[PDB]
Design a protein around this ligand. Structure first.
Ligand code: C2E
Ligand code: CA
Ligand code: CA
Ligand code: CA
Length: 248
């Protein structure tokens, strides 16, 4: 058995599926978007998490097609059900540093946007800070062109350089320590105040407890994500939950 053959095969056999984690407003309410998380439906080994296969997809370069396959799948999955989505519904995708080279990404974004009514969803791309240090100001007509389509850019796992981004996502590690560490609390308050100075939206990730939600809401964190709001879930659970939310 070989890792490369297995992934390359799995992509052709459509074994990489989207799971969807909902985002909620900081002050609560209906779901305003989802983060798309990759899952490997392995026929032998079961449902396999990203951390056991994304690193090799990045080294081998195969994540770029995998992400394209995933974006296409999301358009199939949700393009027909646009009526169930609140206006400006956020759909986020995790993107690599290898994606940031050159211009294909723009085609894929235009393709996804074309599956929905114009302006009805907001497409978001999440990059970590560490993934931006490969080229920091060069072939970045890409970000200009992506923004011209109304695509937004989010810094993933923030807190764990000079752009050109619309949103910060507070890493789980900060949210985990809310209420039991004044230092981390002050640093988290700094990140939140920075986002407001720079006019960037902010999402908190890993919101598990009501203590955490209230703390973040009291400081105007725009959006929440985590097990409190809902775990990553298959297409069907999402459509079922969104159907309920159309009622009242
Ligand atoms: N403890 C805790 N964990 C929570 C909570 N809410 C969500 N999570 C987990 O946090 C991860 C999402 O954060 P991430 O920074 O994108 O971290 C992601 C992301 O870096 C990467 N990844 C996932 N899908 C993709 C993809 O399509 N492309 C790329 N390049 N990377 C991906 O794999 C990482 C792990 O993904 P998952 O295993 O799905 O792990 C998910 C999810 O299961 C919570 O309340 N508590
Ligand atoms: Ca993410
Ligand atoms: Ca990533
Ligand atoms: Ca994170």
């Amino acid at each position: 058995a070989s890792p490369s053959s297995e992934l390359r095969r799995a992509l052709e056999a459509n074994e990489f599926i989207p799971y969807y984690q909902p985002l909620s407003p900081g002050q609560g309410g209906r779901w305003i978007g989802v983060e798309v998380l990759m899952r490997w439906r392995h026929p032998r080994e079961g449902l396999i998490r990203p951390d056991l296969f994304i690193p090799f997809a990045e080294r081998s370069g195969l994540i770029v097609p995998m992400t394209r396959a995933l974006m296409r799948q999301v358009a199939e999955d949700l393009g027909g059900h646009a009526g169930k989505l609140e206006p400006g519904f956020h759909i986020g995708f995790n993107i690599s540093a290898t994606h940031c080279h050159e211009l294909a990404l723009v085609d894929d974004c235009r393709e996804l946007l074309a599956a929905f009514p114009p302006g009805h969803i907001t497409l978001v791309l999440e990059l970590t800070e560490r993934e931006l240090i490969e080229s920091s100001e060069v072939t970045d007509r890409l970000f200009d062109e992506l923004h011209a389509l109304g695509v937004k850019i989010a810094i993933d796992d923030f807190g764990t350089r000079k752009f050109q981004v619309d949103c910060l996502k507070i890493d789980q590690s900060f949210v985990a320590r809310i209420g039991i560490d004044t230092l981390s609390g002050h640093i988290l308050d700094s990140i939140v105040e920075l986002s407001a100075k720079l006019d960037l939206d902010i999402v908190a990730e890993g919101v598990e407890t009501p203590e955490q939600r209230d703390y973040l809401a009291a400081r105007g964190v725009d959006y929440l994500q985590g097990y409190l709001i809902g775990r990553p879930m298959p297409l069907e659970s999402l459509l079922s939950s969104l159907t309920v939310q159309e009622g009242q």
